[PDB]
Amino acid sequence: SGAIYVGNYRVVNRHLATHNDWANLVWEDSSRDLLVSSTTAQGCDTIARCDCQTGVYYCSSRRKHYPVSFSKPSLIFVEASEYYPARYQSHLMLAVGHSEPGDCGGILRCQHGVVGIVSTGGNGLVGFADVRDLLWLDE
Ligand SMILES: COc1ccc(C#N)cc1NC(=O)N1CCC[C@H](C(N)=O)C1
Ligand SMILES: [Zn+2]
């Protein structure tokens, strides 16, 4: 679990979105595993606007933050799950690191701010859904 709070927006994994997220829907993209809903309270997270390939992520299954090198956002094949059939997920970045399904939503940050959230994993790899291209989150 986990979300990014920026301005009047809440960013979450689309597969973990609540009834409230869907009733206050702004945008969602199944191919990116993202959903953005509106909030009544103002968010203070800073979104990074960069091409950083190093950062730190929070791993709830270990109660620890880990430093990682990660790939550039791209289309990566993702195994079928209870939420999606087998498919390419876009805007995904992989790193060598620990993750379990409940780790989705953990923030990945660089010196510039929030880069994305945990979205996939398996076999000692962790995947992050990028949010740096969503320029509208700031306005
Ligand atoms: C952090 O996720 C994991 C980590 C480890 C393992 C293990 N065994 C499995 C996962 N789950 C995972 O990758 N999923 C399930 C939820 C939807 C995700 C998606 N974006 O399509 C794909
Ligand atoms: Zn950066």
Side-chain angles (χ1 to χ4, degrees):
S1 54
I4 305 163
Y5 293 97
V6 52
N8 286 321
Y9 299 124
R10 162 170 142 97
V11 192
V12 280
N13 294 92
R14 191 191 185 275
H15 72 275
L16 296 181
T18 69
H19 288 313
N20 190 56
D21 285 317
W22 279 100
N24 295 287
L25 178 67
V26 169
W27 168 83
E28 54 77 28
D29 188 341
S30 193
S31 78
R32 296 179 64 156
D33 185 42
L34 292 181
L35 180 143
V36 177
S37 61
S38 53
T39 65
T40 59
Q42 210 74 34
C44 291
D45 290 321
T46 286
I47 310 290
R49 300 304 180 190
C50 64
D51 74 347
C52 274
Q53 281 190 247
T54 72
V56 176
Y57 78 107
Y58 180 66
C59 171
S60 68
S61 66
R62 284 291 180 275
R63 285 186 200 135
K64 277 173 164 71
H65 298 259
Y66 290 102
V68 280
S69 292
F70 55 91
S71 63
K72 289 198 171 168
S74 69
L75 276 174
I76 292 163
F77 199 79
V78 180
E79 280 284 356
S81 69
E82 39 179 346
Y83 318 101
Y84 302 104
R87 77 215 208 279
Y88 289 103
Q89 173 164 317
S90 63
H91 297 267
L92 191 60
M93 301 173 290
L94 296 183
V96 172
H98 179 73
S99 70
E100 295 171 36
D103 284 327
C104 285
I107 283 171
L108 174 60
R109 299 181 71 93
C110 64
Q111 60 188 112
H112 308 108
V114 173
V115 174
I117 54 171
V118 175
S119 177
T120 75
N123 302 314
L125 298 160
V126 54
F128 308 97
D130 189 40
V131 297
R132 303 177 279 182
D133 67 315
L134 306 175
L135 308 188
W136 54 269
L137 291 178
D138 283 322
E139 52 227 33

